[PDB]
Design a protein around this ligand. Structure first.
Ligand SMILES: Nc1ncnc2c1ncn2[C@@H]1O[C@H](COP(=O)(O)OP(=O)(O)OP(O)(O)=S)[C@@H](O)[C@H]1O
Ligand SMILES: Nc1ncnc2c1ncn2[C@@H]1O[C@H](COP(=O)(O)OP(=O)(O)OP(O)(O)=S)[C@@H](O)[C@H]1O
Ligand SMILES: Nc1ncnc2c1ncn2[C@@H]1O[C@H](COP(=O)(O)OP(=O)(O)OP(O)(O)=S)[C@@H](O)[C@H]1O
Ligand SMILES: Nc1ncnc2c1ncn2[C@@H]1O[C@H](COP(=O)(O)OP(=O)(O)O)[C@@H](O)[C@H]1O
Ligand SMILES: Nc1ncnc2c1ncn2[C@@H]1O[C@H](COP(=O)(O)OP(=O)(O)O)[C@@H](O)[C@H]1O
Lengths: 582, 568, 568
């Protein structure tokens, strides 16, 4: 009949057992039954945020009907998953949709109060038969709803509920709101323990139950895209397919929690991966790798090494971010170099990061540049720069440079940030900063540091510059810092080592060009004499390397003088540096 | 069948072996096997720019099925492909999209899930008038659908990441543009099929030349599509050259011909001094300095996070400073149209910076945008021109330091504006009379050092630290500017010969034209407008009276203080 | 045969001369053979225009096939024009027309590549009404189709390229517009055809005049089809002149009569100032600038690929910029109420672009057009008015740069909108108070320079370089007020003579008006409402009183200050 054409019996499928076991949801199914045994407006609607198991509530109710675990008034009923695409499709003629829907309604009256109706996507039922001068499904179902003589069950997302049903109050009051919350962690672990049998029967592999509880735990903590139980189910399924292809292509036979971590790190790259000996010996050689690019300035290397080790070691403060820092020193001591060193350690690249230089924000209102603009105003549909740049890749490094340049009340934003890792952009959603490192640099007591780094300890220098910082900032803000570090002007040996590093990357780029070039150490001594001052550090070394290398060497390369394969000693002139061809 | 209406079997031709021997992109096929062997959510989607061979990915998967190179759950499948461009274009009224859609769904339910479907342009599925998310999203969750999606990330997040319920089923597979060497590997995998088609041979140096030049010069279509197109059309051209009335191997010469029509790079960089004197007379040392700086930028020794060249320009304005920038843009990248003239005379405030970089959101000039950075974003290979940089607000120099340090600049709207492909020209006139009054017999270098010390007392030292070289722009004499006036007369005669008039000139008339608007204080454009307004206005007055005839010799003979036109 | 039902062979028509003589186009048919000589994407498609001989390119292909002017692999191939409606005309069943289509496709598979087909309007096969385009798409993606398409770039870009398998069987084979000389050669190919039809003769100076004046004065109708139109319409005109109640040679004067029906102002142009000061008194520098423009453009000193006059009328209110526009309409265009009046000052909205331009498919302004380019599509020869430029959007300025670049417009649907013959002058005021103070005691040059600096602060710098000339309107002197007051008295005399009343004035009353309604600081309309009040209000008091008998002279006598009309 017409019920055969447009409806699908879920209860016959659960009678075949071809539906999923549904475990839990007891108050939700009980209130759904309480609404379904009424006199007027029998119709519960499963308002719940997208992917918390709303279809599975009705499927589990169908299974409880088949098992006979319902009250006596529901024993022997039929749940029919109504189809909207079956009804819209065949009707470009006038009245043909209304013909079908009225025939369905007369069949449902004919079934004598035995058919439970399930309508997935109730928001699809709203704009259903919207042809020019045509009733939708609302204008035809709406009689039989509030006489109680239809046993509809809605299932809709809450954002679809606002736009598509709360806009139409008449059909909005015909139903009964059933909030279906995202489950907490422990109950989701229980549900996943229920569903282990299905995936074991599907992929013929086994699952570690610690991997299950780790998938639920890490999914609730780190992934902010989807919602429970959906994200954890997808973790388990994708791990199962990965193990199946590891076996079948070319080891193991189960699904460990390390496989869960590999799935999560493949999905984003938050380094939940366990400390393998390459990674763990890398992490124990933290300061050694930081002094592969940054000579000197030991104490901040120590502090950030400590913070990243406490992050990776499973001792993360789960609400504050990784490290809430503050760098302080005179101009040109490689503060940005240390930040690029962290980026290169973490991501194998300097500019795989976000640097936002706060000298651009010397006015107040650029707060709205990084957090966005409210509803109504100009740049609403774009988001703040900082929030979006986190919202793509949350495991990153957020760098603020020249923090003395901006207005003091930009730093209520970072009060939020360093309190909880939370930030709310102009559209009004939270952005998790629990995988970020915040570094702020200034040159506050640079006169005081250049004056008194000699003949003083590190500690009371930090004390005195902290007093200067309290003269600068707010007591709220500097409480949020994990650790304030102090930089110092470098000796000439540090600048000679930096010149060695610049010669290393120069010879790297000239082997890329294809030239075997060496240097006299006297030329290194002359370059150390040239770009040196205690007041400015190595940016004079930058310009000295720039001029006295990049001008004559590249001038003689383009002069046809430098032949590849020749030994090229960068020896000295009387006042300059000369290359040879030997 | 309704399968004989909108579906395409690729296991058909792959069982026949009559498709592309798809080589490469193994990992994307592997992740497609990862998604398709799940229990649920078995509809992978492919993400990339159009023309990256996603159809070839599906066909190579089909060939691995035919070859038995797949695990034992992918076998017996039938590769199908549904149109998203006829289910709507045929759809007149209510339910012709949905009618065909449910007919496809039931006829695949007859197929009992042994069928893999392809769908391109997943963005088209969302908006068609409701349509298909509400009818495939059950099959997306039922698992009986075995779709293969294909679209681009921008349409994906514009349309499809709106509804997260549609987002949670499809699994993103990034298919980027392949490299030039991956293109080489694919074409070496496909040179056999070409040479068996046209019965010719193919030069593999011409293959790598075609790949490199297609990567460099043309960015309309991309790899591997443009390489296939250029190889096939060049092979067609060689085939016509054979069958016209002689080589079978397609050469890179025909590649360059179809390239430019349908190589002067390296030595043009080497001869850049001659290039700068192709249109500009005088300023020989400045020409040499600019050409050496260009070659050093192309030498590939400097910072890969710093631009082509940092420059500050001084001297008397209007003498060819802008003309140097025009010819520099011409023989640098294209022509006289990749440049932005910017007066720093205006910008003297904080909202000056908010103008030029970009407004914060919620404010006045936001999607009107920054005056500089939007024009950079439109023309990523240009030359940036600045005028009267001493009239700037001091915080603009912080932005300039960000330019010369990082080669990039976050605008007000919040994105990356790269600067490593342009030339920063900043013009000033602070040491004007230091160069003008001391033009006589003083060298280029010590005048440069003297005005360098002067501007060092003027500007910030850290600002001019970043500047590579400040050329002098010495005031050109009467002979150079007279020659420029002669070149303007030449292009004037060119346009009037386009109109079609044999026009001569007296040399005394040439001297009076050179002495109309010569001025060392203002520039060459006073001479230009002087000669222009003297000649042009009585000319057409004589013309449209009915006096001048095309073909008559028009000598610009002198009057006592004017120039008269004769018809002989 | 079933192929003999409703197919039109073209190889026999080229063999038996039943086609038309197709002349030239070697490179296009060469690349056609190139697309024919490929392994993939083997079918070409004539991306073309309304009236550029796409079917004639098909005819020339068939002519070169029969003449042996093709390669050996394509000689003797069957070229049949499949007729669309002829299959439709003998069919009335859903399954008989489709039966015919299936049978012809099976016969095309049966002929085994010998048939090389052609079907124009491939988009029409996509939407004819299983539609026929998606029915032939298996013949696309089964390696059997040798057909050729023909359409506009819009339908190829939207209905074909956006489809997938319909993309990867074709190319962007673009039909070019031919030259004027090629058009004359084709006219020589079919001069004798029209002459033997209409029993007339055609002069070859009339041929070259028809082609050249169609190339210049016509842009919507196109080469070569506009020449077809003009020649055949002139032939019918000469046939009328014979059969009226004599000539047989079609002259170029007949082409001029055709073009005008669908004259001594060149030396009146030397009396420009006379007519301008007849309508717009004073403002001598603007008169000189407009005179220089009209001289140097109709004589053609600059590029004639531009609109003729591109001015920014600047100055305070009440200077008659609108009056000078209407005076130019009177002089050059002889039609005062033929001008395209659209103000800039509605268009700061982002969504104004629909109405102010013309729309791509995706707007509802696509369902009527853009009201500017609609007006140029109606009126391709007039003055377009853009008042108050200071209230615009910057993309509208980019549209202005498109106008100042092309001399035409590739509009919102990519079709013909032409701009060379039209004269677009925008008006503004932005140098208002500078002129209102310092037009006195200053020159015209430095004022122009300073207001140019002001507009440079307003606009883009090279945008206002594209102005024909920055022109200056200014306050006016004493006698100009009296002359224009005499003009307004004349139109008052005309209005009341059409009422039936005849008016004499005292010159004392003229001096009373010139001393009452006077200040140059604002504009003209203080004088206009002074006239209005101090004349009409006692006059409307007297006439609606029923007192004034017609015939008696209405003498504008004076009081000490006021104006009295008497009846003696
Ligand atoms: N209590 C539960 N017991 C067993 N499986 C569950 C339970 N809750 C959710 N699931 C599973 O969670 C997955 C997703 O739930 P679904 O109901 O299918 O998604 P959904 O509720 O339709 O969300 P939307 O609205 O479609 S985005 C399914 O595989 C369900 O089997
Ligand atoms: N690994 C490969 N081996 C062989 N051919 C390839 C390979 N990768 C790409 N191709 C070819 O490259 C061309 C690209 O065409 P498409 O498959 O249509 O590109 P696409 O990624 O599908 O994007 P669009 O939107 O469909 S054009 C096809 O002719 C493929 O056969
Ligand atoms: N210079 C003038 N010569 C003659 N009539 C003028 C002049 N200036 C204004 N008018 C009169 O003013 C009206 C023309 O409209 P207006 O907008 O005033 O033109 P306009 O001179 O351009 O002033 P603006 O700048 O457009 S506000 C008509 O009544 C004209 O007769
Ligand atoms: N310890 C160091 N290691 C490597 N480079 C350094 C070091 N100290 C200074 N430099 C050089 O000096 C510059 C200092 O950079 P940055 O940290 O931005 O200076 P500031 O201290 O003003 O922030 C760098 O560009 C780098 O080239
Ligand atoms: N070389 C030529 N020889 C003869 N006629 C030509 C030639 N080129 C173009 N034509 C004419 O141009 C006309 C336009 O042809 P067609 O492409 O069918 O129109 P449209 O471009 O409007 O579709 C044809 O009638 C044809 O006679």
């Amino acid at each position: 009949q017409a019920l055969k054409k447009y409806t699908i019996d879920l209860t016959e499928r659960a009678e075949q057992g071809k539906l999923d076991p549904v475990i839990g949801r007891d108050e939700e199914i009980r209130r759904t039954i309480q609404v379904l045994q009424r006199r007027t407006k029998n119709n519960p609607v499963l308002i719940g945020e997208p992917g918390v198991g709303k279809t599975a509530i009705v499927e589990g109710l169908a299974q409880r009907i088949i098992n006979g675990e319902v009250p006596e008034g529901l024993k022997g009923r039929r749940v029919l998953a109504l189809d909207m695409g079956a009804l819209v499709a065949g009707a470009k003629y006038r009245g043909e949709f209304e013909e079908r829907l009225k025939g369905v309604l007369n069949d449902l009256a004919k079934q004598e109060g035995n058919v439970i109706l399930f309508i997935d996507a109730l928001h699809t039922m709203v704009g259903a038969g919207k042809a020019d001068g045509a009733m939708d499904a609302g204008n035809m179902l709406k009689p039989a709803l509030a006489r109680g003589e239809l046993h509809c069950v809605g299932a809709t997302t809450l954002d679809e509920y606002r736009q598509y049903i709360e806009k139409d109050a008449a059909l909005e009051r015909r139903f009964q709101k059933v909030f279906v919350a995202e489950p907490s962690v422990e109950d989701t672990i229980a549900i996943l323990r229920g569903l282990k049998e299905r995936y074991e029967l599907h992929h013929h592999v086994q699952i570690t139950d610690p991997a299950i509880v780790a998938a639920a735990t890490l999914s609730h903590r780190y992934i902010a895209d989807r919602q429970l139980p959906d994200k954890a189910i997808d973790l388990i399924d994708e791990a199962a397919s990965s193990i199946r292809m590891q076996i079948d292509s070319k080891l193991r036979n189960k699904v460990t929690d390390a496989e869960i971590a590999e799935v999560l790190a493949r999905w984003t790259g938050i380094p939940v991966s366990r400390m393998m000996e390459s990674e763990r010996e890398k992490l124990l050689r933290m300061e050694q790798e930081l002094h592969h690019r940054v000579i000197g300035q030991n104490e901040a290397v120590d502090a950030v090494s400590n913070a990243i080790r406490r992050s990776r070691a499973g001792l993360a403060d789960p609400n504050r971010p990784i490290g809430s820092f503050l760098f302080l020193g005179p101009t040109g001591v490689g503060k940005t170099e240390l930040c690029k060193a962290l980026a290169n350690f973490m991501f194998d690249s300097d500019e795989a990061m976000v640097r936002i230089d706060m000298s651009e924000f010397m006015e107040k209102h650029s707060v709205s540049r990084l957090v966005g603009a409210p509803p109504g105003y100009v740049g609403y549909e774009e988001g703040g720069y900082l929030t979006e740049a986190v919202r793509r890749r949350p495991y990153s490094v957020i760098l603020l440079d020249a923090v003395e340049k901006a207005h003091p009340d930009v730093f209520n934003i970072l009060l939020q940030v360093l309190d909880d890792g939370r930030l709310t952009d102009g559209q009004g959603r939270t952005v998790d900063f629990r995988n970020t490192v915040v570094i702020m640099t200034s040159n506050l007591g640079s006169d005081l540091i250049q004056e008194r780094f000699g003949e003083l300890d590190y500690a009371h220098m930090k004390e005195l510059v902290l007093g200067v910082v309290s003269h600068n900032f707010r007591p709220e803000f500097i409480n949020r810092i994990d650790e304030v570090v102090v930089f110092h002007p470098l000796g000439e040996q540090h600048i000679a080592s930096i010149a060695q590093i610049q010669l290393k990357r120069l010879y790297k780029r000239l082997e890329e060009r294809g030239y075997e070039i060496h240097i006299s150490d006297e030329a290194l001594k002359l370059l150390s004499e040239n770009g040196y001052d205690p007041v400015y550090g190595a940016r004079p070394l930058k310009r000295a390397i720039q001029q006295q290398i990049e001008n004559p060497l590249a001038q003689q390369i383009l002069s046809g003088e430098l032949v590849p394969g020749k030994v090229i000693r960068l020896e000295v002139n009387e006042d300059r540096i000369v290359a040879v061809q030997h």
